[PDB]
Design an enzyme around this catalytic site. Sequence first.
Site, PDB file in Angstrom:
ATOM      1  N   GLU A 130      16.111 -37.410  36.411  1.00  0.00           N
ATOM      2  CA  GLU A 130      14.875 -36.721  35.995  1.00  0.00           C
ATOM      3  C   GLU A 130      14.306 -37.350  34.726  1.00  0.00           C
ATOM      4  O   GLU A 130      13.241 -36.856  34.250  1.00  0.00           O
ATOM      5  CB  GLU A 130      15.153 -35.223  35.849  1.00  0.00           C
ATOM      6  CG  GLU A 130      15.496 -34.607  37.195  1.00  0.00           C
ATOM      7  CD  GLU A 130      15.732 -33.110  37.252  1.00  0.00           C
ATOM      8  OE1 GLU A 130      15.361 -32.384  36.246  1.00  0.00           O
ATOM      9  OE2 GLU A 130      16.265 -32.643  38.325  1.00  0.00           O
ATOM     10  N   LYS A 144       9.117 -25.283  45.670  1.00  0.00           N
ATOM     11  CA  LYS A 144       9.459 -26.640  46.147  1.00  0.00           C
ATOM     12  C   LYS A 144       8.956 -26.757  47.580  1.00  0.00           C
ATOM     13  O   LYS A 144       9.558 -26.169  48.470  1.00  0.00           O
ATOM     14  CB  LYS A 144      10.956 -26.897  46.105  1.00  0.00           C
ATOM     15  CG  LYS A 144      11.538 -27.034  44.706  1.00  0.00           C
ATOM     16  CD  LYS A 144      13.028 -27.138  44.743  1.00  0.00           C
ATOM     17  CE  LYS A 144      13.598 -27.681  43.460  1.00  0.00           C
ATOM     18  NZ  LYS A 144      15.057 -27.432  43.419  1.00  0.00           N
TER      19      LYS A 144
HETATM   20 MG   LIG Z   1      17.433 -25.925  40.560  1.00  0.00          MG
END
Ligand SMILES: [Mg+2]
Lengths: 423, 423, 423, 423
Positions: free
Chosen positions: B204, B334
């Site tokens: 990330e 998501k």
């Molecule tokens: Mg998560």
Amino acid sequence: MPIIEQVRAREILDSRGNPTVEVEVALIDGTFARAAVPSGASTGEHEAVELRDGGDRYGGKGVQKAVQAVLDEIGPAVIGLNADDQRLVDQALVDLDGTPDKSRLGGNAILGVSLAVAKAAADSAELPLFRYVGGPNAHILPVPMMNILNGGAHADTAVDIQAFMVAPIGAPSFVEALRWGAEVYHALKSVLKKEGLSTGLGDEGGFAPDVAGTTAALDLISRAIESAGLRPGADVALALDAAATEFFTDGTGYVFETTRTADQMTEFYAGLLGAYPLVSIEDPLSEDDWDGWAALTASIGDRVQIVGDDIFVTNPERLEEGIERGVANALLVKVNQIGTLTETLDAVTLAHHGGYRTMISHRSGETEDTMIADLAVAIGSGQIKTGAPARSERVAKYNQLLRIEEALGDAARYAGDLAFPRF
Amino acid sequence: MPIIEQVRAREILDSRGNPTVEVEVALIDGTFARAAVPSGASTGEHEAVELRDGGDRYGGKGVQKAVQAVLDEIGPAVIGLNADDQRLVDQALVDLDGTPDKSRLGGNAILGVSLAVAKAAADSAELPLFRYVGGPNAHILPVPMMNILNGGAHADTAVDIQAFMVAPIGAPSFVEALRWGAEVYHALKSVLKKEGLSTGLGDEGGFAPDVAGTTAALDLISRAIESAGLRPGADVALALDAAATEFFTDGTGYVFETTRTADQMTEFYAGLLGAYPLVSIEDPLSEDDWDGWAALTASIGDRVQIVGDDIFVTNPERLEEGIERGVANALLVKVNQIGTLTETLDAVTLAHHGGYRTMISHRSGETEDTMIADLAVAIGSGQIKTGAPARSERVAKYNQLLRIEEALGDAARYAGDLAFPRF
Amino acid sequence: MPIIEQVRAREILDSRGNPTVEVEVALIDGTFARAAVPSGASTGEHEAVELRDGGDRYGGKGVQKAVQAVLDEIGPAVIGLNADDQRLVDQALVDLDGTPDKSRLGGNAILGVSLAVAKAAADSAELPLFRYVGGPNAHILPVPMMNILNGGAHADTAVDIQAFMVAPIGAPSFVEALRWGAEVYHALKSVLKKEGLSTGLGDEGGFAPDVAGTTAALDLISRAIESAGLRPGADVALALDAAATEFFTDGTGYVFETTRTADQMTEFYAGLLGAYPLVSIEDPLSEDDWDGWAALTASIGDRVQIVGDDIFVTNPERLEEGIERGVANALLVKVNQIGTLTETLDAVTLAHHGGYRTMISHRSGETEDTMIADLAVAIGSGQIKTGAPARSERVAKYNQLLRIEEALGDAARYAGDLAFPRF
Amino acid sequence: MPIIEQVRAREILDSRGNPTVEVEVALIDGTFARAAVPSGASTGEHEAVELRDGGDRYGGKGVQKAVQAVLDEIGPAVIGLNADDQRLVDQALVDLDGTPDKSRLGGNAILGVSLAVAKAAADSAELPLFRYVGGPNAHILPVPMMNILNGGAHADTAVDIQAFMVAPIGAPSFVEALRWGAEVYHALKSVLKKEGLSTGLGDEGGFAPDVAGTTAALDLISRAIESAGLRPGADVALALDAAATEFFTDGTGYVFETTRTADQMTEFYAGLLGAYPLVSIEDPLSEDDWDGWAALTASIGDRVQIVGDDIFVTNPERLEEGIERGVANALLVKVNQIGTLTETLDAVTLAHHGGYRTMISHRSGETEDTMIADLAVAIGSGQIKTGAPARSERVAKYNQLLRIEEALGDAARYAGDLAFPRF
Ligand SMILES: [Mg+2]
Ligand SMILES: [Cl-]
Ligand SMILES: [Cl-]
Ligand SMILES: [Cl-]
Ligand SMILES: [Cl-]
Ligand SMILES: [Cl-]
Ligand SMILES: [Cl-]
Ligand SMILES: [Cl-]
Ligand SMILES: [Cl-]
Ligand SMILES: [Cl-]
Ligand SMILES: [Cl-]
Ligand SMILES: [Cl-]
Ligand SMILES: [Cl-]
Ligand SMILES: [Mg+2]
Ligand SMILES: [Mg+2]
Ligand SMILES: [Mg+2]
């Protein structure tokens, strides 16, 4: 390019024969749109101000000053703006006016331009208005909350509740729900003829028979539902607009059917919930009775939707105060109470984010404009209050929801009983 | 007319060098759009299934079967549909697949087509993607929840919390908020160099220094904020993804830094709230610990945002169960957990209507696609989780929010501390 | 090229909440038009037949068979025709049906297609509908004949005259004439409140107070005109729809307020002319009383306009018989009585050529469609009957005449007292 | 957009070789139209004034001043107007001139611009001129009133009647009616050769043989009809233009074949009705003999059409005076007698509303312009007077009616004997 090129306004008449503003916007790509502004018979203290002309003409209710304001000042301030920048356009209208309640240019002049710009943006983008406002996810047809019997200040009777509505929650689809509403309204006409009561229509197209009080009115409606071959509550439930400000005295109390306190009004409403398939009650208390509303919402708010109309006036500021105080669980949405589309959608956002439901509403003075039908689907309220299935200022909205349902095809969903989880 | 004419797919690589699906849609008016699909490193049990090829090629992670499914089956089922009918297109994808978890065509094939169609519809309508999805009212720039220090299964350390994020809530604007995030991240790089800790980046873009535990990691972040000339909490607050499923044993408990119960984990989290300016904690307990989550949300849910990720998987069905049970107060969104834009927006709707906040999220395997930046503004989440201000699969999203802020002009509003009323 | 490409129909609701047909026509140049069909509460024996569904649904009044007829049969028979060939299209509809009264496809299905085609032709030619139907010479705004007080079969009173109308003949312009109509209607509301009489509205938006008879109703209207600051006759004159078929017994006579003969009804009407500023009387006798009408027209026809409604049903054949027999001096024009635009204009032609005046009329079941406003100016009737200045199915027509007046600029002329040379 | 961009004029020659005005109008959309102006040999006292140049050039009949007026003054006053606003354009021409009889700019300059604008509006709207002027209901092909034998001031004979016409009323269609007219005209040529009479043509293409008087001329025509295989009256009837002003002395009487009074002329005309299949007589008395005409119309007006030409000059004002006085039952329509299309259509409206028939007419000085053919169908006169079927200034009109008939297809109707109900 959807750049605003021209803005014009004219005086037309509303559904009660009083003047109102109609605005036309033309964009440089040849897009043309037209929006008309509704008007309330009586209004909340806290509403955006309507500019009215005064003098003799149309009883003082002319809107030539509003029309002139659109041509002299608003047009020049928004021509050259992109009609897609709804927030910039609405901010430029609010800054132009420069007052809290739009008292200089008028909420009626400003909302006219706001709604026409939104319509022109949607046409330019080649999208139906519900889809341009709500995005591609807009698909929920509202339960129609149909005013079929009136009382209060809107009547010459002993009923103090202003509106008695039917809600066809059990219908499989909006096309069937409109038919259910129509068949119960036709059967109520027959029940009223058979009791020797008046079948003259009020402003919203509902009947105003001279009856004893609230329970007498609910009983006639229940008879009508059964007479249509439908089950009260499971198929067609009930809702009220008490409009309790109309029978409230400042600092004193509620003169209802007996002077009563906020807590006594709540005992009455609680009694109606035990006896009747009520899904919603609007303005059970008055527009500034913050203590009464909190106690009422604490008492019965788990059992029924409690709608703020005059207490909120579609204002983010007054709605925020209500959410904070645990006052109501639903917002009545009236674009002309606040004056711009943008401020209307900020109020809907504040409500929806905050767990409150929304109900899009007509005004008693309506037009042939169907934009609130598109709004109700755009925001996915699942609820609309736009009159009886009579008088085309009311029926044009229901016809526009039919057209929106048809255009969505298998993507359409009717809110039905999911609009009212408490029932 | 935005009628779908052509649908193609190709295998590209994500930000970890594993294959993923990219889909291109062409409309009959010459509109062309491209959408890439993210992928999670480890996944929730309940996520939509990714079709993977197996065998030797790319370690079994090839997506040639997904690509073939887009060409042989999905294209033929959606060509001739209007790209504006996002719900019809998404329903036709879901019906085509015919399974609960999209295991036949793959969530990766299906989401590719769904997102590309939405992008093509927006281009055809000549609207930016945020405005086509969210309507003209979309204007809120999210607080960026930026992962600057990692632990858990994503690390080789004794920290069991997966992600430590900074949230520049006190910034006047998104342009200033990105800069604050960048300056704290740069100062954390300097603090880590000065403590002799590793400055290698994780997936990330955050650092993964080998530190003692949770409070050691929070202390380094607090030092970084001060070193940037900013005040912890007032300017830059903190947030966590515990991802507690990764250290939970089925039917047993939480192995954390000591085996602990759900209630003990809650005492730990409560301790962190007293000691640190925490605004949000994601997945504090495991994906099927419905009792633990309810008790935790009852305990600390008034004091901090509690985000469901693996417990909800962006699924309306599992989110409805949580709202019913008083589990969490926020939904991690998501798109690839559920597989279509339409089902993503129904989950956001269910949350927002229900008083829950939303946070749009990246996956650990991301692409150069910036669509979630547009999504975060379209839905007015006020919150986005899309990495550290390093690695362009993360920074491309932040750059797209800059462009959206600039295009909104004076209509833009930065969510700031209004995203977190509990802090 | 304005070639018809697509024809669709849907069931919508009229202003009384009963179903009616709406038709959409698309041309190959992308022109789209929509037309809705009105419906009479009670109908002339001689009208074109409305196809109704029967059974339970909407009380037997569904129009799904009409809608299906537009899709299965009419569309296929007119697609590929030029929408500019209104007479060819209307002849193909009449030949398709193959019956005298359009009983197979329905006058409602056929008129829907006829009016939509005309609207599409006008849009394609980029001309306003009044100018496409009437040519560049169409410029005369009609005196609005506004129904403000009802009786007959349309009431629960002792008044046998069905409609009492005001006609603002002395106004300088249509904008002033609408205002005069509105101000007298508002003052009649106040006069009715002050006499303790009902202010509930009928279908046409007029009041239905329980009054003694014809002269009592005329006196209240005269009081209203004076109360508005206007002079009865010089400013606002009066008109009636007796609708005498509704109180006539086949072969017997007129039961009115006393059984009377045709000649006695004439003495009554003659009495009203001496006492009141009456400019017009519609259907003073019944639909097949050819002898009575001739004698009445000979008696008073020099002193007042005598309008044939139910006696003519907008039919060239029955109107020719009347001109021959010296029966009436005006034709009420109702597009849905005959079923096509072409046959409507042949009836108007037969009348106008023959020295008879025309008055375009609404039906008691109206829609948001404003096409008759355009028709009234196109044919230069100088007279329109489209309700009270209340209920937007009535007011939308008045608003459309405002827009037509504005678009004509200094070319507009208000018919005023030149519509009624006999007064 | 059909905005007027350019207006030009040129001097051309008419069918007698005298100058007349031709006007071209160009619109901003690239539409171009051309209109030529006719001229009368001798004129009514009351006609719009033709501007003529004077001096030597073309015998004083040059129209260079009219041409200059179109370029210097009319163009600048109408450029920027919408060509669809025919009434605004015609009012601006009339206001520009500022005189009763258009003596400043000339009726010839003004009508040129008026007709060209109408033609340009029709082209822009992509409609044939008959359909743009008359709307979609224009479909009636006129009976052609064909001048085949001349006398009066137009001859060197003892016949005082100016024009003897045939009217093929019994024909099934306009194509057959033109052929009948042509075959009778050819047979009259043969009858004249066989009687040793002159076959030289007059201005209207008719023969001017030196014959005894009215009955001698009618007998030759009757012989011609029979020689063509047609029945006088049933197939081909007769009509006259006496043009009685040409043989009337102011305050004195009618010098005809004997000085006679108005009442004596009427006895003569009555005699001709008993002896011959006469359907129409034009100008039986002089242009200001209001008493004579009333008495004649009272006498024979039930038995035959009586046409006002010089008495009305296509003027609403003089026609209104005639309707009031019961003078004539038909109006001869000559666009150049009044000067604008708008005033021509107001005169047609006044007539048609008033029970009077119309006959569109040529002038003795005509052009290749066919616009009156389109006018005759647009207004549905059912009658046209545009010469013998010889000389293409006459035949071009008949050819244009063939083209209009063909374009209407099965919608066309030939007026036939329905143009003359009295016969
Ligand atoms: Mg998560
Ligand atoms: Cl704002
Ligand atoms: Cl709540
Ligand atoms: Cl809601
Ligand atoms: Cl779905
Ligand atoms: Cl909550
Ligand atoms: Cl949120
Ligand atoms: Cl026909
Ligand atoms: Cl008459
Ligand atoms: Cl008329
Ligand atoms: Cl004029
Ligand atoms: Cl006559
Ligand atoms: Cl005629
Ligand atoms: Mg209310
Ligand atoms: Mg009637
Ligand atoms: Mg003449």
